């Protein structure tokens, strides 16, 4: 109490020993870390390919919330709750002689990404989603084209992992509805006008323009400061 002082302490740099500070980059980064930070960039650093230019655009959490909850009621039964079910229908289907007769209709949501054939020629495509990570770069430059030509309302969304839980897998894809019940009939057609007015109207204009002008880092801390003194010092 009586020995109360102030002012920061000073060490003669060459003298004494200094302790570790808030180490952020000091703890040196692993091998592929310096690689991955320069790997998955695409729409951050330089220009972007006109064939894509949709990874920078994200969907609001106000519409995506009702979208995910809509697909909650529509999901196939898991392996833990299906194989045991086969023993229950042993005296109704097998010994009952009723193949797909005395069973409720499995209203399952549509799916498929890099493997879509019968959902185009037969015109059975409605709500179309896009993957998030997308490791094959060559398998993303023709995804909107599979919906624009047929006039299929495609929705540029980010995520397929949580939607992989309602399909008994890990990763998902699109989620269209061809044979939906009357319970969610008004909750499906309402989202149609939203997607078409926020995604379908922006394709031809996006294809023409390239895309860039994104600020970097220390680069904009000198380049933008140079034009300021060059015009009005």
């Amino acid at each position: 109490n009586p020995l109360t002082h102030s002012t920061p302490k000073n060490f003669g740099i060459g003298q004494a020993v200094q302790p570790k500070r808030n180490l952020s980059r000091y703890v040196k980064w692993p091998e592929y870390v310096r690689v991955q930070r320069q790997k998955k960039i695409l729409s951050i650093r330089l220009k972007v390919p006109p064939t894509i230019a949709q990874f920078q655009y994200t969907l609001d959490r106000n519409t995506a919330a009702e979208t995910f909850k809509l697909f909650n009621k529509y999901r196939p039964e898991t392996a833990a709750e299906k194989k045991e079910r086969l023993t229950k229908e042993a005296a109704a289907v097998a010994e009952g002689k009723s193949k797909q007769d005395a069973s409720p209709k499995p209203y399952a949501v549509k799916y498929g990404l890099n493997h879509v054939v019968a959902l185009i020629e037969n015109k059975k495509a409605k709500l179309v989603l896009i993957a998030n990570d997308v490791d094959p770069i060559e398998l993303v430059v023709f995804l909107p084209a599979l919906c624009k030509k047929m006039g299929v309302p495609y929705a540029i969304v980010k995520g397929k992992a949580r939607l992989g839980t309602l399909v008994n897998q890990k990763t998902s894809a699109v989620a269209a509805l061809t044979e939906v019940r009357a319970e969610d009939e008004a909750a499906l057609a309402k989202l149609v006008s939203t997607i078409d007015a926020n995604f379908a109207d922006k394709y031809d204009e996006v294809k023409k323009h390239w895309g860039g002008g994104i600020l970097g880092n220390k680069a904009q801390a000198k380049m933008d400061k140079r034009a300021k003194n060059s015009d009005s010092a």
Partner: protein
């Protein structure tokens, strides 16, 4: 099969490390915010003579700011200081006798020490710079510096270095003839050997492309081209002039 004694450096034996007599290098330690534009202080105490030739070396050991350690680092010492004299070289301070400053914060006449040519970096991956503080005037224009030496060459580089003012008793050693002879083996048992420079009008007869035979006379020009053949390079290379430099100067 009969080669000449210019094409020898390809065995790795009689050209390897031949200098037990010496100790360490001369390049400075770890560089930080201090050893540049701001404030840099050096030390010099045990002025142990440089092994192999005529130069002083000091036990310049800095108390490591990063960790409590005083690694012994034998660096190049200077003449003019006694047994212990710290360096008073502050960019925001002043200047005295025997200081270390970059080649931009000082006016003309600044003979520093040799360490690096690049804007600092503890022994720049290069070295095609100066041999130390040995430098006259500089250049106030930006960070550029135009050095000049009586050797006959020019160089324009940066203006940042970690060289300290000081001299070395080397002038006179080569100006005073090796009188009491007996020097060649222990002469250049230093780092390698390159003092046989070595004759014979009939050293290798049924051969001598230069010219010899049985009498003291050459034939072809001893001026071997640089970009022509690497199997005949024996003697002068890329000649131009030849005369006799007198002692009396007083030129333009």
């Amino acid at each position: 099969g009969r080669v000449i004694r210019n094409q020898r450096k390809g065995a790795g034996s009689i050209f390897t490390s031949h200098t037990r007599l010496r100790q360490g290098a001369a390049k400075l330690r770890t560089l930080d915010y201090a050893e540049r534009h701001g404030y840099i202080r050096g030390i010099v105490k045990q002025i142990v003579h440089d092994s192999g030739r005529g130069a002083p070396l000091a036990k310049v050991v800095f108390r490591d700011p990063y960790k409590y350690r005083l690694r012994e680092e034998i660096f190049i010492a200077n003449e003019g200081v006694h047994t212990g004299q710290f360096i008073y070289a502050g960019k925001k301070a002043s200047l005295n006798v025997g200081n270390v400053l970059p080649l931009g914060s000082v006016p003309e006449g600044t003979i520093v020490s040799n360490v690096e040519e690049k804007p600092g970096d503890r022994g720049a991956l290069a070295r095609a710079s100066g041999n130390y503080v040995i430098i006259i005037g500089h250049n106030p224009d930006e960070n550029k510096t135009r050095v000049r030496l009586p050797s006959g060459a020019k160089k324009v580089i940066s203006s940042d270095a970690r060289g300290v003012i000081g001299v070395i008793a080397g002038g006179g050693r080569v100006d005073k003839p090796l009188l009491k002879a007996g020097r060649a083996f222990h002469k250049y048992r230093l780092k390698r050997n390159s003092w046989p420079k070595t004759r014979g009008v009939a050293m290798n007869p049924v051969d001598h492309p230069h010219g010899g035979g049985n009498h003291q006379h050459i034939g072809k020009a001893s001026t071997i081209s640089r970009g022509a053949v690497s199997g005949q390079k024996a003697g002068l290379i890329a000649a131009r002039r030849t005369g006799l430099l007198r002692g009396s100067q007083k030129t333009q």
